[PDB]
Coordinates of C-alpha atoms and ligand atoms in Angstrom, one line a residue:
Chain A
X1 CA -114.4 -29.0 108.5
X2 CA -113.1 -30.6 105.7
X3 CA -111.8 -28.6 102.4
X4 CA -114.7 -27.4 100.3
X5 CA -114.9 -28.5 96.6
X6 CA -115.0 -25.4 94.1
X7 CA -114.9 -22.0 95.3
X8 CA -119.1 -20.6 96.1
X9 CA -117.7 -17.4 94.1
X10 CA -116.5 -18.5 90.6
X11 CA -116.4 -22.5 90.6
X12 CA -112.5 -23.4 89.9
X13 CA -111.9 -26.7 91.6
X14 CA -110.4 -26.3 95.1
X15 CA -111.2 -29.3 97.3
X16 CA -107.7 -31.0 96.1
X17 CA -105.3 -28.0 96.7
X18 CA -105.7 -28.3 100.4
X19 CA -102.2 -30.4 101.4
X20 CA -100.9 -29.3 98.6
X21 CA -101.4 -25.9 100.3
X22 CA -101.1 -27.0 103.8
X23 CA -97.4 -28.5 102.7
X24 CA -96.2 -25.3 101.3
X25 CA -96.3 -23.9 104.6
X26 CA -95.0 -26.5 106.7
X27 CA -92.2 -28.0 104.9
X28 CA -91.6 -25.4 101.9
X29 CA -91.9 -22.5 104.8
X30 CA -93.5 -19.8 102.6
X31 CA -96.0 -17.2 103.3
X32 CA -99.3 -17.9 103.0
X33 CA -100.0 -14.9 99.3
X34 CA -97.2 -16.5 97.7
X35 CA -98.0 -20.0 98.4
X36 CA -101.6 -19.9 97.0
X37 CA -100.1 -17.8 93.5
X38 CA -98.6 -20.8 93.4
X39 CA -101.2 -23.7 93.6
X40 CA -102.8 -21.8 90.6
X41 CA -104.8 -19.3 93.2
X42 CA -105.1 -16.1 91.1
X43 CA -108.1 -14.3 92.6
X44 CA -109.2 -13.5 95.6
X45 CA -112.9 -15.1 95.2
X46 CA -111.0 -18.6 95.3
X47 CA -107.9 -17.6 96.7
X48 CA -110.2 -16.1 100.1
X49 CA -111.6 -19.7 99.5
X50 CA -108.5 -21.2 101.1
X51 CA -106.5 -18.7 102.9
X52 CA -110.0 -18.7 105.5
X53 CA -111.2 -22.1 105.7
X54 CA -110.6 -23.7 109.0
X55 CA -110.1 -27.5 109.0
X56 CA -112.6 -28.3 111.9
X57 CA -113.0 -31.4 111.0
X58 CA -109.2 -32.4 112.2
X59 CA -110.5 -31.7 115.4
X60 CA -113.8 -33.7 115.2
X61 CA -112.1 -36.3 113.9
X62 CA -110.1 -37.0 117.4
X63 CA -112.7 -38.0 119.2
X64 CA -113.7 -41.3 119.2
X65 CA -116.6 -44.0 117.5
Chain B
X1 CA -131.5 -5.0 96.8
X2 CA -133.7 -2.3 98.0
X3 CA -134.0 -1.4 101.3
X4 CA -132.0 -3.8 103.7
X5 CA -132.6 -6.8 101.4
X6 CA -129.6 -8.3 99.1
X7 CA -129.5 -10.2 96.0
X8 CA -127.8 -13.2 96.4
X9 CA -125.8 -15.4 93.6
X10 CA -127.7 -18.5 93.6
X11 CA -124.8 -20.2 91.9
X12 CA -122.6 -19.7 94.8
X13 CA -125.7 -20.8 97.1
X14 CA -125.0 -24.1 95.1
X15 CA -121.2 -24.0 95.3
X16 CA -122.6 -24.6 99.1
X17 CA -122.2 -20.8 100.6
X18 CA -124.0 -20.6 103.7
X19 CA -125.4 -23.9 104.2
X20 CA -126.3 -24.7 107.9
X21 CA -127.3 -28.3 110.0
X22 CA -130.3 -28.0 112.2
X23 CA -130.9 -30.6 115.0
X24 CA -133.5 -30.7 117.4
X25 CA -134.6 -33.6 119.9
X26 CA -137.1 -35.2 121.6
X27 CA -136.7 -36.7 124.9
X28 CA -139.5 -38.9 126.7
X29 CA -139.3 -41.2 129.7
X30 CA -141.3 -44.3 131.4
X31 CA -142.8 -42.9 134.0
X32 CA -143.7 -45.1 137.0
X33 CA -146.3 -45.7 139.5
X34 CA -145.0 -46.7 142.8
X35 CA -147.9 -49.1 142.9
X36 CA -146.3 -50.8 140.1
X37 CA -147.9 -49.7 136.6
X38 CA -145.3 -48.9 134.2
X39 CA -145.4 -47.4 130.5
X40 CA -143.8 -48.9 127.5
X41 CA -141.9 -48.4 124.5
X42 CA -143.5 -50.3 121.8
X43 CA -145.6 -50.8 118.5
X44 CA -148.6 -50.5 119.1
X45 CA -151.8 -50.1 116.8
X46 CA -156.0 -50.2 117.5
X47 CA -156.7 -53.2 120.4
X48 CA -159.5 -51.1 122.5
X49 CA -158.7 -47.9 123.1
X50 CA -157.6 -45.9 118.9
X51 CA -156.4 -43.0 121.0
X52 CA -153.1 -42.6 118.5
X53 CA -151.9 -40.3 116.4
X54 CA -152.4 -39.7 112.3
X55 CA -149.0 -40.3 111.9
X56 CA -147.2 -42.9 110.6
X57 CA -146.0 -45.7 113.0
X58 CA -144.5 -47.8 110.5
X59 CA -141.2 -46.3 110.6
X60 CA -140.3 -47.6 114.5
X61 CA -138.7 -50.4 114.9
X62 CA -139.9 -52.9 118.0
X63 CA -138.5 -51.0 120.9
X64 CA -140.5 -48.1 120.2
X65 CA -137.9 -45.3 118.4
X66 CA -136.3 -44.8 115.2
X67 CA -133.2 -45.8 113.5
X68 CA -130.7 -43.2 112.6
X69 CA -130.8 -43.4 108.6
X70 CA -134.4 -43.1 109.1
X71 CA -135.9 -40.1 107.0
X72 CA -138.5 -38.6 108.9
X73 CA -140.7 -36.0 107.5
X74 CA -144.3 -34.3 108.6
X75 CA -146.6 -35.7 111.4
X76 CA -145.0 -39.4 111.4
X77 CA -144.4 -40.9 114.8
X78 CA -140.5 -41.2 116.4
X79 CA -141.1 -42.8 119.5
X80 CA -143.5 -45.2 120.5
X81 CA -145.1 -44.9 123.9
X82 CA -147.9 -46.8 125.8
X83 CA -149.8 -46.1 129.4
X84 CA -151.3 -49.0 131.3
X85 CA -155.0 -47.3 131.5
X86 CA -157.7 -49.0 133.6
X87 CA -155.3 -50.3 128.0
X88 CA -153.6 -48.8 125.0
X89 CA -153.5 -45.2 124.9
X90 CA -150.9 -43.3 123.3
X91 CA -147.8 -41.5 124.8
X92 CA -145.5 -41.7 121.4
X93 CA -144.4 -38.3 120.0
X94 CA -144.4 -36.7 116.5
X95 CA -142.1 -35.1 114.8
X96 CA -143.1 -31.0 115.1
X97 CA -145.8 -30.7 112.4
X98 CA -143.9 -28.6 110.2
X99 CA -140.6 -29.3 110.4
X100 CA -138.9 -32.5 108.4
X101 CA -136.0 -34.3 107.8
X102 CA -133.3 -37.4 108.7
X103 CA -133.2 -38.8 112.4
X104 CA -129.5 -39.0 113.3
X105 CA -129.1 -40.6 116.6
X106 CA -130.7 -42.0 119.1
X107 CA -130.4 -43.2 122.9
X108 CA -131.5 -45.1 125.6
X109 CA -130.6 -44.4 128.9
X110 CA -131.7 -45.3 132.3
X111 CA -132.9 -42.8 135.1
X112 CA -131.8 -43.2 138.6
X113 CA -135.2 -44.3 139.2
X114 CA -134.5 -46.9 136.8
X115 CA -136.7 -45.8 134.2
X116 CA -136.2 -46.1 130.4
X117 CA -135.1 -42.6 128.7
X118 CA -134.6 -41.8 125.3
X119 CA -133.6 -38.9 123.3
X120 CA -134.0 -38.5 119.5
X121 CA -132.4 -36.3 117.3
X122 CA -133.8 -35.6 114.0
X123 CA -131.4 -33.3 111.7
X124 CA -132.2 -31.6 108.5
X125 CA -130.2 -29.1 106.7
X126 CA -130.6 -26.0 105.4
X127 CA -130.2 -24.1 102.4
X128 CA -130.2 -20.2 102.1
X129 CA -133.5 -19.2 100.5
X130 CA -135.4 -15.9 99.3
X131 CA -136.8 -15.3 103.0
X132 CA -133.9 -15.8 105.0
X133 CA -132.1 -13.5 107.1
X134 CA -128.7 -12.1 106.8
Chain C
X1 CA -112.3 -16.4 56.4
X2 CA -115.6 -14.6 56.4
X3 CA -117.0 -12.5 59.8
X4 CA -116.5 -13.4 63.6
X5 CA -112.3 -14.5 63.1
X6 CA -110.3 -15.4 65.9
X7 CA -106.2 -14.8 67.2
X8 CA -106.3 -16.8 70.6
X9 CA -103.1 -15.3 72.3
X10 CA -101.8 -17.3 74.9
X11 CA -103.8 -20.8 75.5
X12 CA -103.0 -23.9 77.5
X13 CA -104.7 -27.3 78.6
X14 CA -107.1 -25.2 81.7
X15 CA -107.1 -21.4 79.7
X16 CA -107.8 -20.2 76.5
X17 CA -107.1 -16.2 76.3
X18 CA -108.1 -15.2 72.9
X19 CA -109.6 -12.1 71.2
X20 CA -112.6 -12.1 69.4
X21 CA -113.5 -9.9 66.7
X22 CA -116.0 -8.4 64.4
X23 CA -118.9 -9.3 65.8
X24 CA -121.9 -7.6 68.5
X25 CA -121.2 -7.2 71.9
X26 CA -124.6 -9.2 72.3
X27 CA -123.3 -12.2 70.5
X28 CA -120.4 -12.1 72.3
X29 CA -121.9 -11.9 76.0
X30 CA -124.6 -14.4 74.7
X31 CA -121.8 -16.9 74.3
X32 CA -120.6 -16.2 77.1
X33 CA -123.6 -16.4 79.3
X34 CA -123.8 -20.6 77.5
X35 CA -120.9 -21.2 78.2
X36 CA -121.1 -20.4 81.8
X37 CA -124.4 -22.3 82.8
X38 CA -125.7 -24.3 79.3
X39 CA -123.1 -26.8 78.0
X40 CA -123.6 -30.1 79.3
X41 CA -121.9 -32.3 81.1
X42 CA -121.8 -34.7 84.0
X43 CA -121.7 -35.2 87.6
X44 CA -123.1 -37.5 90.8
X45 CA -126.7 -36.4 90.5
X46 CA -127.7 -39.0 93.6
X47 CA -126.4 -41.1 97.0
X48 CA -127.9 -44.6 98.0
X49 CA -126.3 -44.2 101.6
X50 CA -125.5 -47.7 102.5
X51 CA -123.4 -47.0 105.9
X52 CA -121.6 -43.5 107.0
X53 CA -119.6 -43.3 110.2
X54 CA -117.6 -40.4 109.7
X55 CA -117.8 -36.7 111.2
X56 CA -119.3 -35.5 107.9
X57 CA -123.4 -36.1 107.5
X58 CA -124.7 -38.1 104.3
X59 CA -126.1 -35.0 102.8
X60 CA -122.9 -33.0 103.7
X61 CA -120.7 -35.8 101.5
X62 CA -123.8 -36.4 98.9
X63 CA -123.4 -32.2 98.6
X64 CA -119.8 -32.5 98.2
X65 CA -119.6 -35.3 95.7
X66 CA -121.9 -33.2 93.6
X67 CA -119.1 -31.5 92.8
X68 CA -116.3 -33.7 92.4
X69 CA -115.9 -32.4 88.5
X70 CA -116.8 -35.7 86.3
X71 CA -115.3 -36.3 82.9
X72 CA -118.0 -35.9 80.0
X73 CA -115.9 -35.0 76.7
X74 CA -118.4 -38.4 75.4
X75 CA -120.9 -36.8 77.0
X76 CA -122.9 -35.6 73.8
X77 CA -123.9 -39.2 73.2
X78 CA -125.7 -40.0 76.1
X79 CA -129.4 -39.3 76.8
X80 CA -130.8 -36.9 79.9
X81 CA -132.0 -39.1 82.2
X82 CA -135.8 -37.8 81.8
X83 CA -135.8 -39.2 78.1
X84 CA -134.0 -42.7 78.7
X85 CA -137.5 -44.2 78.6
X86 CA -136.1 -46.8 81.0
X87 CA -138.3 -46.2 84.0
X88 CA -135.5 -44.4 86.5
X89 CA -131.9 -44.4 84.6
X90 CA -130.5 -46.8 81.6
X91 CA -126.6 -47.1 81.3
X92 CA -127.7 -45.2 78.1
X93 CA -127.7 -41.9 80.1
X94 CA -126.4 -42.4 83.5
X95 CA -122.8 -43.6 84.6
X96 CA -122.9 -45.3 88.1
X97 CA -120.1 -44.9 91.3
X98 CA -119.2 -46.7 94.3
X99 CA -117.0 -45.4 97.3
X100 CA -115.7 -48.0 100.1
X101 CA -113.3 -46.7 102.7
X102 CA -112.6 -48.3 106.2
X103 CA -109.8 -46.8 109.0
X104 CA -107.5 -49.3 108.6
X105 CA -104.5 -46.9 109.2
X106 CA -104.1 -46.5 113.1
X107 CA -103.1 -42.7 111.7
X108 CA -105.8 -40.7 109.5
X109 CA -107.2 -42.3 106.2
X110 CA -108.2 -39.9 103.8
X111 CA -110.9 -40.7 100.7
X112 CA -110.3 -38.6 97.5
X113 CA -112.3 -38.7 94.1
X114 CA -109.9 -41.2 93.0
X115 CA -111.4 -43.8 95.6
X116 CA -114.6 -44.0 93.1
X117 CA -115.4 -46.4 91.2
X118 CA -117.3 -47.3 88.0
X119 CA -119.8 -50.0 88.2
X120 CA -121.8 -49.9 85.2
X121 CA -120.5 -49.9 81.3
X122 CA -119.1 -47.1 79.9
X123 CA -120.1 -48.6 76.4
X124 CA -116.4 -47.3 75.7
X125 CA -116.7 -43.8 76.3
X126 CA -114.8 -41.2 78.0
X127 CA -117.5 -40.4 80.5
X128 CA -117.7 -40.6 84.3
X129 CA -114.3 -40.7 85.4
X130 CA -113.3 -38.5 88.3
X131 CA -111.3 -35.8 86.6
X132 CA -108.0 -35.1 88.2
X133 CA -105.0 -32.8 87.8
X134 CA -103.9 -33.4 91.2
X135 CA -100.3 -33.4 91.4
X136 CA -99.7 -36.5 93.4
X137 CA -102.7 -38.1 92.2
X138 CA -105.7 -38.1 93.9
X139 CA -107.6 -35.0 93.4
X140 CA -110.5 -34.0 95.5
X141 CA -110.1 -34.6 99.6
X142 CA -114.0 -36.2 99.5
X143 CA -113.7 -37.3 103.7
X144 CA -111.2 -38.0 106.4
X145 CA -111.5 -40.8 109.0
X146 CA -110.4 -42.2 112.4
X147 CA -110.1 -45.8 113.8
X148 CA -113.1 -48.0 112.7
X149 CA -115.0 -45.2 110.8
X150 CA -116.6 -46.5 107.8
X151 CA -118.1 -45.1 104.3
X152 CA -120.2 -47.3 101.6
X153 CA -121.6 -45.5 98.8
X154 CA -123.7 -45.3 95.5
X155 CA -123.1 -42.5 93.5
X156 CA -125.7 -42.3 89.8
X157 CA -124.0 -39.4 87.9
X158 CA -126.3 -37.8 84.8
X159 CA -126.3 -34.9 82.4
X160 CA -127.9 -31.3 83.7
X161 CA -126.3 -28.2 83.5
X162 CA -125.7 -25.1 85.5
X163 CA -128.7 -23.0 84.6
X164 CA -130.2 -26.1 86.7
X165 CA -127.4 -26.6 89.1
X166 CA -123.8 -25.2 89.3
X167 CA -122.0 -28.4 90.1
X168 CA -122.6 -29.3 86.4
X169 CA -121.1 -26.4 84.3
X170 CA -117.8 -26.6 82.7
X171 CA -117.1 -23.2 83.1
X172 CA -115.0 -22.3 86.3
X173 CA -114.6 -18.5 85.5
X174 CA -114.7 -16.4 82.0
X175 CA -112.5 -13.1 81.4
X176 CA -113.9 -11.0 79.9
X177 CA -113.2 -7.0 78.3
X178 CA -112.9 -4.5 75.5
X179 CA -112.7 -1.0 74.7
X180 CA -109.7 -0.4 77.6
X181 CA -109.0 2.8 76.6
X182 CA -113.0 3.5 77.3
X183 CA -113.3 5.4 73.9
X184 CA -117.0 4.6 73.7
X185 CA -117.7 6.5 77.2
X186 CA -119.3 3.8 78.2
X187 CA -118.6 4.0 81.6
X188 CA -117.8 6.9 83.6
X189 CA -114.4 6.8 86.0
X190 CA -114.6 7.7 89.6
X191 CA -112.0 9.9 90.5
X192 CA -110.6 12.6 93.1
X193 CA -107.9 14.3 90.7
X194 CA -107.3 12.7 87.6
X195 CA -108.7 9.6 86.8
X196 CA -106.0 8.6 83.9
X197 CA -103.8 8.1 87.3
X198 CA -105.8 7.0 89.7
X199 CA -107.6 4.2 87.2
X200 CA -105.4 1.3 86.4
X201 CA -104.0 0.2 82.9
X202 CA -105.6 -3.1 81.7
X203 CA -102.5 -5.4 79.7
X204 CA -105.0 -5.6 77.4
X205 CA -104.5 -1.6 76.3
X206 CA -101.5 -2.5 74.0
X207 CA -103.6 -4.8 71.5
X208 CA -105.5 -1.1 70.4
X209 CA -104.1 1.9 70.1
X210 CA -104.4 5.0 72.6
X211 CA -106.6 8.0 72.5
X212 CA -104.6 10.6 71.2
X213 CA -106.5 13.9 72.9
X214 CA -107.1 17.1 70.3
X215 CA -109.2 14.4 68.2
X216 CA -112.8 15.5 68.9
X217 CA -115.7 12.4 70.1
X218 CA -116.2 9.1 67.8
X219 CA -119.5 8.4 67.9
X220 CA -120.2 5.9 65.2
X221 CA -117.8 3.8 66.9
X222 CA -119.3 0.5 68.2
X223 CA -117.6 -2.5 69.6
X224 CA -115.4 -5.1 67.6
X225 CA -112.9 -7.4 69.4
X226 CA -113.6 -8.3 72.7
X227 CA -110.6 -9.9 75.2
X228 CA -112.1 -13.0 76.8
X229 CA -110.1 -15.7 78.6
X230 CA -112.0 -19.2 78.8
X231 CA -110.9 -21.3 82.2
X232 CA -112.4 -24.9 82.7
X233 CA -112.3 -27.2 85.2
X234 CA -111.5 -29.7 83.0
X235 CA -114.7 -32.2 82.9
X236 CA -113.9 -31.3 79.2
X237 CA -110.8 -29.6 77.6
X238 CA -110.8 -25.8 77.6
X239 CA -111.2 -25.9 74.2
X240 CA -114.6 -27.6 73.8
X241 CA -116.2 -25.6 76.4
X242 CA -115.6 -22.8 73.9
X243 CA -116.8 -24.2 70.8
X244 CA -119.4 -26.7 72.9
X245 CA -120.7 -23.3 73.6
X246 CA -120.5 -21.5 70.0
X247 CA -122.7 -24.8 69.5
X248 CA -125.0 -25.1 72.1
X249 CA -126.1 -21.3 71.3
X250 CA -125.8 -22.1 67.6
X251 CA -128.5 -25.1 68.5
X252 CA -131.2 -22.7 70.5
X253 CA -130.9 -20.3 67.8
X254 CA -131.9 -23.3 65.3
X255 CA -134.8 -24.6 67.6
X256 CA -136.9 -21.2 67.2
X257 CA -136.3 -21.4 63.5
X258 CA -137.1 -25.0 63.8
X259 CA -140.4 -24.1 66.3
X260 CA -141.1 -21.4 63.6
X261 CA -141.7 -23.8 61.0
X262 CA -143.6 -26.4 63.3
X263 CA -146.1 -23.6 63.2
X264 CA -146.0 -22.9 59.8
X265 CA -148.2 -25.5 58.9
X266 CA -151.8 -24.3 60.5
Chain D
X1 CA -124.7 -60.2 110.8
X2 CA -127.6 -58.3 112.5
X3 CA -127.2 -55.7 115.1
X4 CA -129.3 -53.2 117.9
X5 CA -127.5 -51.0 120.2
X6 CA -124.0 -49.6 121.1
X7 CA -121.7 -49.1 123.3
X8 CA -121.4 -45.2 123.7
X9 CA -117.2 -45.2 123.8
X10 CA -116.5 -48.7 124.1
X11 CA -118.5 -48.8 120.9
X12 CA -119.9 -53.0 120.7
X13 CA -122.7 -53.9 119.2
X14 CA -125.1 -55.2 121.8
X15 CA -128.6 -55.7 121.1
X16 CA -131.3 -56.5 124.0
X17 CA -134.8 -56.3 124.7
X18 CA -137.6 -55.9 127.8
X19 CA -136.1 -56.2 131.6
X20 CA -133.1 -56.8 130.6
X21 CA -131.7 -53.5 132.3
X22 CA -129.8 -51.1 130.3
X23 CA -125.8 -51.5 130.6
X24 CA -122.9 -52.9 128.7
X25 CA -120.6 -55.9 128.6
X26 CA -118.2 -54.5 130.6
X27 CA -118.1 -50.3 130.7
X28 CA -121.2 -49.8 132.6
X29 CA -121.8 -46.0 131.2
X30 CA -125.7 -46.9 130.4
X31 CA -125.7 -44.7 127.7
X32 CA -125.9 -46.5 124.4
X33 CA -126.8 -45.7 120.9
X34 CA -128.6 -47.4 118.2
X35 CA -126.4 -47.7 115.0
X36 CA -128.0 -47.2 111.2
X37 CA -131.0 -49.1 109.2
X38 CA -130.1 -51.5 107.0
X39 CA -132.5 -50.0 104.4
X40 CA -130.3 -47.7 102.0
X41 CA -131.4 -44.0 102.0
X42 CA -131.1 -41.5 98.7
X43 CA -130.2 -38.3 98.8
X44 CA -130.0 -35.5 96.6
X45 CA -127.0 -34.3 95.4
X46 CA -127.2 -30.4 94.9
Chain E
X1 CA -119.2 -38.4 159.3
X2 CA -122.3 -37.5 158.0
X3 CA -124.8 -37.3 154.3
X4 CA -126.1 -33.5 154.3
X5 CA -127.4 -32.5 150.9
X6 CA -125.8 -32.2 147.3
X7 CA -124.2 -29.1 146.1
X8 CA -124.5 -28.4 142.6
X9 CA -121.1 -27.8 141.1
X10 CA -119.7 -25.6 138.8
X11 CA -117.9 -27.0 135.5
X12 CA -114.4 -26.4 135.5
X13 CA -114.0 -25.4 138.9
X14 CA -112.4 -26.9 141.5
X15 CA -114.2 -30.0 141.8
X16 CA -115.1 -30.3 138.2
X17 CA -112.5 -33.4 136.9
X18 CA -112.0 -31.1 134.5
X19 CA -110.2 -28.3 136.1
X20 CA -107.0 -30.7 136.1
X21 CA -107.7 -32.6 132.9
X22 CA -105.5 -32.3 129.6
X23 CA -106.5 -31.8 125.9
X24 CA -106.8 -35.2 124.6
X25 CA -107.7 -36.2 128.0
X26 CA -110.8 -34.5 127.9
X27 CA -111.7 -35.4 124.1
X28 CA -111.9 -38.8 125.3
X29 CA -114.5 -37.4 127.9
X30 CA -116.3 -36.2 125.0
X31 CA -116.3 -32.7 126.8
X32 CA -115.0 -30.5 124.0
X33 CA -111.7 -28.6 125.1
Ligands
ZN1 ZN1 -113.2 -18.5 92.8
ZN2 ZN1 -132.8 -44.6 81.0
ZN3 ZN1 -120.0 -50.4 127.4

């Protein structure tokens, strides 16, 4: 349900890295702990931010009006 | 922290941790009188009877219910409701006395009896405060 | 130069490691602590909802846009709201946004930060403009949306800072450390065997020499140079946010004296 | 240019008022919403 | 031949459309999968 700006722990920015991170996966075929060292992820209070999240909202959005 | 009770970062309650939607909803119908006397969904105000309500008709529209962006808040009406008396008593119904928020959708409907049925649903949202439960 | 100096180690455009010494602990946390939740800046402090038909509620988005970090580096120079004498915001302390999206795309339309625009004058200023180190682009995924699912807003950004709201502060995250080789016992390690192994070495050990056992307990010792690392999140560079804060602090320090002498006088 | 009600999935503003039953131009599904107020709404945004 | 009663069904069962019914089939059914 939709990437959530700043991580509730510390407050880094976060809401942006999502394709970023989602791409990393899919087309860079990486494993998620490497991946997010690399979108600037360093602890686990923001990287926890990402690795859980589920997009939801992907879903919701396939419905209809 | 003491005994089963936690301290918890406001900052982070910011950040929006643990923020939850709440909808509820109304539902009311016309009910019918085979010997044809039917109720209504409108406006109305004073004209004989002033059985109403405190609350605060003037945020229906003319059919009698709400509009989604709406905000809705303590006693004010959310659907507007008359019975044919013998002729304007109330049948319209409040939003729960203590609760409060935004409407969020509405509907009319018919029931196989033909009769005009609506559902309202006001949602609010909630933020984790000192007394809530975790 | 005098007291407090500085050698910032390494130090970019979002970090600022650096270790400073000679001064108080106190002091040191004080700073800190203003830094985190009392320097200034900006953000969308209101939403005029004109017409939402996406998944997301108003209040969901309003919530999220909040966030969406703001610049501010001008922000210094423009009034809190609750002093603009106008009656409910001037352009003299309150930037303005818009955000219009439609589902034209017959495949997913998604509405970043960068979709927002300025309405009102900047009076030439860098203020209000959506911050973004994205690298394609368009920082901040505010909303997603299907076929004919629309999204008008009015965004009213203004100053505040953490201490009454967290979307505001600059701060992001702040290091902070001394005495790695706990030579002032002031803390006591957990162990099952030997703590000296089980206890990790902070990188930070190097920058002061080790223990050296047979010497007996230094008790005078107190607590110069302390190994802080500033992140931001960029609604103002790094930098600022640590001397915006030295400031800030510098200023509420000033305000008692100043209070003092307001009293002076009867 | 002004608006009432909606089609529930074949989504078309409709708009009606007393007897006038309660379907839709076409898909009969008598369900029907009532799409937004023109009147802006604020919000807060913490 | 002949009307005798209604028989409450069970979602997802045999005679429940959706039984059969696909994933994107049903979303447009508004039934969530
Ligand atoms: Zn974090
Ligand atoms: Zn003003
Ligand atoms: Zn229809």
């Amino acid at each position: 349900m939709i990437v959530p700006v700043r991580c509730f722990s510390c407050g880094k920015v976060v809401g942006d890295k999502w394709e970023s991170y989602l791409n990393l996966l899919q087309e860079d075929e990486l494993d998620e702990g490497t991946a997010l060292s690399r979108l600037g992820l360093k602890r686990y209070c923001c990287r926890r931010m990402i690795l859980t999240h589920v997009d939801l909202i992907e879903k919701f959005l396939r419905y209809n009006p | 922290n003491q005994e089963d009770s936690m301290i918890m970062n406001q900052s982070s309650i910011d950040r929006g941790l643990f923020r939850s939607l709440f909808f509820r909803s109304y539902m009311d119908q016309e009910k019918k009188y085979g010997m044809s006397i039917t109720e209504t969904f409108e406006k109305p105000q004073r004209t004989n009877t002033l059985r109403m309500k405190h609350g605060t008709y003037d945020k229906l529209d003319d059919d009698g219910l709400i509009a989604p962006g709406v905000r809705v808040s303590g006693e004010d009406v959310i659907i507007g409701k008359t019975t044919p008396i013998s002729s304007k008593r109330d049948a319209s119904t409040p939003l729960r006395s203590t609760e409060n928020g935004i409407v969020d959708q509405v509907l009319v409907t018919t029931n196989q009896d033909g009769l005009k049925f609506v559902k309202v649903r006001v949602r609010t949202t909630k933020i984790p405060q000192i007394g809530d439960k975790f | 130069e005098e007291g407090p100096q500085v050698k910032i180690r390494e130090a970019s455009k979002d970090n600022v490691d650096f270790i400073l010494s000679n001064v108080d602990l106190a002091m040191a946390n004080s700073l800190r602590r203003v830094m985190i939740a009392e320097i200034p800046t900006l953000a969308i402090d209101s939403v005029e909802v004109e017409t939402n038909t996406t998944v997301l509620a108003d209040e969901f988005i309003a919530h999220r846009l909040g966030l969406i970090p703001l610049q501010s580096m001008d922000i210094e120079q423009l009034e809190y709201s609750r002093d603009c004498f106008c009656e409910d915001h001037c352009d003299k302390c309150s930037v303005v946004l818009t955000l219009q999206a439609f589902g034209e795309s017959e495949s997913t339309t998604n509405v970043y930060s960068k979709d927002l625009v300025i309405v009102s004058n900047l009076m030439g200023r860098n203020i209000g403009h959506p911050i973004i180190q994205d690298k394609e682009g368009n920082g901040v995924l505010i909303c997603k949306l299907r076929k004919g699912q629309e999204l008008k807003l009015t965004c009213v950004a203004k100053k505040g800072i953490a201490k009454e709201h967290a979307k505001w502060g600059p701060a992001a995250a702040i290091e902070f450390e001394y005495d790695p080789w706990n030579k002032l016992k002031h803390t006591d390690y957990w162990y099952e065997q030997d703590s000296a192994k089980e206890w990790p070495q902070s990188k930070n050990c190097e920058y002061e020499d080790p223990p050296n056992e047979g010497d007996p307990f230094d008790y005078k010792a107190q607590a110069d140079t302390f190994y802080m690392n500033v992140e931001s999140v960029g609604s103002i560079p790094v930098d600022q946010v640590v001397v915006r804060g030295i400031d800030t602090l510098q200023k509420k320090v000033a305000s008692i004296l100043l209070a003092l002498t307001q009293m002076d006088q009867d | 240019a002004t608006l009432k009600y909606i089609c529930a999935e074949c989504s078309s503003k409709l708009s009606l008022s007393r007897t006038d039953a309660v379907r839709c131009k076409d898909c009969g599904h008598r369900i029907l919403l009532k799409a937004r107020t023109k009147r802006l709404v604020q919000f807060e945004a913490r | 031949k002949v009307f005798i009663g209604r028989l409450p069904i069970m979602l997802r069962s045999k005679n429940c459309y959706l039984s059969e019914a696909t994933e994107s089939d049903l979303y447009k059914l508004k039934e969530c999968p």
